[PDB]
Amino acid sequence: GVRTSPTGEKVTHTGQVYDDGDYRKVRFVGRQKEVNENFAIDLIAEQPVSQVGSRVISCDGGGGALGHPRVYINLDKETKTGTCGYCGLQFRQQHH
Amino acid sequence: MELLQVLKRGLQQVSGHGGLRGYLRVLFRANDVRVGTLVGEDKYGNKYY
Amino acid sequence: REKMFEFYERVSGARMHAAYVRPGGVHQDLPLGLMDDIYEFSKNFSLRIDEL
Amino acid sequence: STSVKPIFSRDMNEAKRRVRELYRAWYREVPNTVHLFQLDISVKQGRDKVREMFKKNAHITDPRVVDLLVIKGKMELEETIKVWKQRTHVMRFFHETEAPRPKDFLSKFYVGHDP
Amino acid sequence: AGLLKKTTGLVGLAVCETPHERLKILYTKILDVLGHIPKNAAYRKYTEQITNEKLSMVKAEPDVKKLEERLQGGQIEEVILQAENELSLARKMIQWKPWEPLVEEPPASQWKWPI
Amino acid sequence: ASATRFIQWLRNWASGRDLQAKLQLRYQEISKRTQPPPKLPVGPSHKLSNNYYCTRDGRREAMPPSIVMSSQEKKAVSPAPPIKRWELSQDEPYL
Amino acid sequence: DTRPTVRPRNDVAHKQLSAFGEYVAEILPKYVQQVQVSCFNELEICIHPDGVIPVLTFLRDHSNAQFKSLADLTAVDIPTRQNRFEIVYNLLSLRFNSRIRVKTYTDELTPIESSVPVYKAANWYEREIWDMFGVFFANHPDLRRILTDYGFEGHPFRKDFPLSGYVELRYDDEVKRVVAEPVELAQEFRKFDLNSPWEAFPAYRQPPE
Amino acid sequence: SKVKQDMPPVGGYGPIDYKRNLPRRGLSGYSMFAVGIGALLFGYW
Amino acid sequence: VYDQVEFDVPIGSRGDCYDRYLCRVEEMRQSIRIISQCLNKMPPGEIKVDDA
Amino acid sequence: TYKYVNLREPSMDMKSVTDRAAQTLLWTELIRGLGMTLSYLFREPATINYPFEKGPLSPRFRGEHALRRYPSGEERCIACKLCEAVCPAQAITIEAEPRADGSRRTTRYDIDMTKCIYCGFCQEACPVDAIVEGPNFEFSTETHEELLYNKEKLLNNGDKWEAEIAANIQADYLYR
Ligand SMILES: CCCCCCCCCCCCCCCCCC(=O)OC[C@H](COP(=O)([O-])OCC[N+](C)(C)C)OC(=O)CCCCCCCCCCCCCCCCC
Ligand SMILES: CCCCCCCCCCCCCCCCCC(=O)OC[C@H](COP(=O)(O)OCCN)OC(=O)CCCCCCCCCCCCCCCCC
């Protein structure tokens, strides 16, 4: 999420911000600091975990050829959910 | 006469913009006084023809 | 030339510097309907040269 | 081995003659250069610069290298006489906007890492 | 003999009134110059061979158009110009003496690609 | 295409051509800007068998130059047969 | 030659060029050092630098060559060679619809005779070679820089010349003119090591050192 | 379903003119000079 | 595939700027002639070499 | 096959000589040139009324760059650096590190729009359709610095033009 540093400058999704003594803050005087307010780390975390019945599931990102290369995710571990290395969607095997 | 239709077709552009005030508004904003079919209007007020 | 720039733009996306022809062939197939538009442009171009 | 095709001069004695001939052409040209280009330098500064350029290669003993230096020098002279060069090209020999860089070890030490 | 052409179609290449007589002169002059080249030089053996072949055609075909189809060198005015060039070449091969052995072999890896 | 009959006559006469037949401004005879999706074909190498790459590997068939001569009654030859003379066009020999 | 993706061979032209390569080497043995024909049918004649005027004159005037057009003339810099420069002549014959490549060599200090007497087209190609490589052509009607700026020092197309050079230009308001200063780059050019550590073409494998 | 590329129509395209077309206009030289001379005579009269 | 098309090469006679202008205008006409043949002989298939 | 362009012999009969005499004295072939420009005066001009009308474009148009997201909001870019390696102008600078959730993501994605040649090689090389060239072309600036796009500027461009960008990829991805 977008949060402001004590001096008031916004912090980007990469965690970048200028210190209170950094002369480079002069570039924002009379202008604005461009910051994207839709942090991708928050939005992916809002997606529900998909329940599946097989030990191995495939993700192409949705949209077929408009997604990402099809990869196969192993769901044998019960402690954690299998995560797509491309798009971050999580899958869990039904009742292990 | 096709000549009369031209003059008549030019008098219908005044009425198609809502009168002289509307006709002059589009003559000075856009430098064109054609009348077209309203395809739609967006949320900012732009009207597309 | 402006109309022939659209043929460039409709096969590559750039009006001039297409980067379309590459070692091995071309980059993408002609979009549907382009050859019909080239026929229409070519059908009249001879008259343009006559005026020239 | 050690037998090579010459360019213009077969030995240093012959080569040095071309060096002197080139120096006399540059020496006579500076007054015209300082006039046509409307340079704010004196004829003395220009002729000092020519001398500085010649002494920069006083250690050469290969006649062929000397022949190329004269060849390159004559191309420079031709560019200046015919005013192919502009005022900017003739003043690049003086480095007027380059801040003097340090020479001693301590001054080089304070400003950076370069030798 | 045939009617005289009005133009050769090539700019600056004038029509020749007497193509046969001029060709017989040039080929004969070439064969005389080639007599000064050593008998075993490949330039003499090859150049005399092709010159004799063209000379025979000139002597065995009075029609210019039919002669052109045999020589296969374009217009008959082009064939005359090539005869003039070959004659000039032969006069220069004597001075150069290319039939002599190789002046100097290249360094060990001069024509080695890739490096 | 909106020109009156009189102006069409005037411009056709002043140029000597029938301009209306070949208008340089485009109209509804152009293609639709939305088109049906394509289904492009595949190449000759899209096969499941008899398609080993070493049998169609063009790069690996290139060879180094073949040395004809190296310094490390035979008839005369030319680089190729003399070029055949061009033939005058029958479509329109003279412009 | 039925394979769709492979380039067909023209073995008729390969024989003809090989035959003519021997023909030139037989007529000019004083200068010809090596002849070869590539797999795409391009004939190369490698000569001694002394043979530039004899070889090109023969190839332009001989009735069986008639290479009347100089397609191009250029140099290649190979630092590892004793003679780092390789002067390349690309000739075209309109009579025989053929092409030939003539190659020689030189170094930083050895001149090469100018071919302007043989081809008027070589006037600017030799200026470009001198300007971009520093190869001197003897007896050139007028040799000087053609592409580089006036007063430019060095030869850009040498392999040891840096890509961005040594100097750059800006405008200075103090002297009211354009000045030249040592090059500083806001972003340095990023060198990519693209070579794969696995051999690609066994046919060209050089003998082990 | 089946391949669909950008291709010509089944029968091909119609003929395309390319050759020069400069139509002949005007009157002959004789008529043009006759009209000009007749204008002068009426003007002089 | 230039050997599969038909076109005429314009040739000058004077070697001047007017003959080179006529050659260029006539070459434009021949390009329309080739475009007609390319629009009708266009074959189907892939557009880049099938060698990945 | 060749043809002659200027190899013609004029007729020498008295009617042809008089015709050429009338052309010389009465400027007939110059009057004919006037008639061609008079015809254009009475044709409709080809001008469009910009900015109220726009020149036609196509879905393949290569305009301003944008970074796209998946429908869930996650960034498509996974810091592979294929765009950086293929960019002919070296206009792309990328840095990456594991994100707080362990995802392969970028911390720097800069495009110097003054080095870029708008060639589209980056969107060809992207295996996840992350970096695209959008349809926008009206983005002139009053200062140089505004053309040095960073990651925040590129994500804002993607979020702004996604509606149009997605429809153009939908119209052209079968040709790719
Ligand atoms: C029967 C009794 C016997 C006597 C009867 C005689 C009657 C006929 C009288 C002679 C008619 C002469 C007509 C004038 C000729 C002058 C022109 C000339 O010299 O031609 C040769 C000249 C030159 O022709 P040339 O370049 O081909 O060279 C001629 C000479 N040789 C070929 C040998 C080199 O033509 C021109 O003047 C070119 C015109 C310049 C371009 C001007 C733009 C064109 C404008 C067109 C619109 C004009 C509107 C004018 C009306 C305005 C109204 C206010
Ligand atoms: C020497 C020429 C004599 C005239 C010179 C002086 C002109 C007046 C300039 C000073 C006063 C400013 C008037 C405003 C400029 C005129 C154009 C204009 O602005 O139109 C505005 C008006 C519509 O305003 P509206 O849209 O309702 O309000 C905003 C809603 N969001 O739409 C209107 O136009 C309202 C109608 C009154 C203003 C008309 C302006 C007339 C200008 C001359 C018309 C000439 C047209 C013919 C041209 C020659 C053709 C042969």
Ligand SMILES: CCCCCCCCCCCCCCCCCC(=O)OC[C@H](COP(=O)(O)OCCN)OC(=O)CCCCCCCCCCCCCCCCC
């Ligand atoms: C018929 C139209 C009458 C109205 C025209 C009014 C305009 C006059 C100005 C234009 C000149 C035309 C008048 C000259 C006579 C034309 C008729 C004529 O010459 O007879 C036709 C006859 C056929 O010609 P042909 O046999 O095919 O070849 C020519 C071989 N001598 O040709 C002949 O063989 C006869 C001999 C031809 C040579 C005679 C000399 C002609 C050239 C002298 C200059 C004429 C112009 C002088 C006036 C200049 C001012 C305009």
Ligand code: SF4
């Ligand atoms: S469009 Fe081309 S030049 Fe621009 S960033 Fe992409 S790859 Fe680089």
Ligand code: SF4
């Ligand atoms: S934009 Fe695409 S190609 Fe570039 S680093 Fe990201 S995922 Fe890789």
Ligand SMILES: [Zn+2]
């Ligand atoms: Zn996924």
